[PDB]
Amino acid sequence: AEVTQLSNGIVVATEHNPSAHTASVGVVFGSGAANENPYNNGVSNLWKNIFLSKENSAVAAKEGLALSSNISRDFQSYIVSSLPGSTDKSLDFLNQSFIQQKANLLSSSNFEATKKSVLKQVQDFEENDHPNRVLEHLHSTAFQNTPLSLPTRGTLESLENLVVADLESFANNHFLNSNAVVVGTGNIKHEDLVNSIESKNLSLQTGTKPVLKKKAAFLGSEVRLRDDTLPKAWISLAVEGEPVNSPNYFVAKLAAQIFGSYNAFEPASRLQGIKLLDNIQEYQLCDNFNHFSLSYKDSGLWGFSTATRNVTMIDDLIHFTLKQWNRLTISVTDTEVERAKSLLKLQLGQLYESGNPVNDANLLGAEVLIKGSKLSLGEAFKKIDAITVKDVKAWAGKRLWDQDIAIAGTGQIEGLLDYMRIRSDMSMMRW
């Protein structure tokens, strides 16, 4: 259980697992939706779908190869999967169809067919997926006029004016050897992957990606998208949090785990050791909530999201939740900290030790692109067990107590009160 990195001008990372039955090989780039502008937003989402189109997936299926891809704000992925004794064929396909030749993929017929499907994907998302479009709107009001505001799928208006030239320009600027990591997970040995690469030569482009003029900045604000015909209210609320490669990275994750997640219709979720639940269940002000701590290269967010059918008691839900947050500065106990320690270990122990090599490749490539190295799971546990009550109170006194907030909501949100009555609940007065 250890990763091995080498460099030849090309970075090559690998987590070998001898007891698996598959192998994944791919390339991860260090540019995401936070590396484009409002005019070409969605060009990366359209690159993913050109990779996964028919005539490229057909050519892989005849050889016994499956394909995958993912767009995020800091990185992109293009992965190939196979049986363990078929990994050299995986690398060849990744060489031919992607890095060297792509005139086959950017044809006039394949481009229009791909654009039609992607527009239908995005239009469907904006009309039916309410919890996820409110979290995207939160990012856009918190980081307005800054690169961390742009949605990852793109916007239906900017996505309509794209041509092949926009794709080719974006490729020449960001798909570069200086901005790339080659990964390998599952039943694959490091030496074999290194040997297969030097037998070929395998370089995409040289480097010099553009530098981004503006840095990300948090701004307290709100955006309300009112729709009285929907049957619920969906709300998300956050403060500024921690970026990746921060000293307070695990302390913010432990603090989110203290308040946790809830489903009203599951019996065992009603019995969790969370003091907020003693307040909501007597009048049943929500159906579910979840606390998050999101982290990027430049900034982060810390907060919660909720959905509810009780549209006359929204003000009681927001009030009781924000008063529990205040206790992290004043009166958090030792039992609440020892519970969140061991449940945080179970959480990220399941994220980093699933059975899917595709998830391993995305995690590994994103971490090595920032830190140059991966922190093992035995090391992360020791940092978590060394946190005390004093560290939590010091973090909360700086990040939560009387600080500005960002809010987004949709649906039946008449009962959501104004900004300054919610902002005033971030301090107590009775300390």
Binding site: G220, S221, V223, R226, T312
Partner: protein, 93 residues
């Protein structure tokens, strides 16, 4: 208690207006903006604009009633002078 006869107003969540769809609202925190920002370009732009509109509805009435008080007060002082004693004994009868 029992419910009484209902109103043309409700409360938060059921205020009693029409259903809304397709309106979006944006706002910025006051801590993130600078107060006392333009209050000239206010007393010289908007107050003078608001004055210029609603001043002929207040001053034409004021001019009619003040003229009336004048001509009466002028005439009274004449009646009780010595040059207006003949008129006084005419009008007071």
């Amino acid at each position: 208690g029992p419910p009484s006869g209902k109103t043309y107003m409700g409360w938060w969540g059921h205020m009693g207006g029409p259903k809304q769809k397709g309106i979006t609202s944006y706002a910025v925190s006051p801590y993130a903006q600078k107060p006392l920002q333009g209050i000239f370009h206010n007393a010289v732009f908007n107050s003078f604009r608001r004055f210029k509109s609603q001043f002929l509805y207040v001053l034409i009435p004021a001019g009619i009633y003040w003229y009336w008080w004048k001509n009466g007060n002028e005439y009274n002082e004449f009646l009780y002078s010595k040059a207006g004693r003949e008129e006084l004994e005419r009008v007071n009868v």
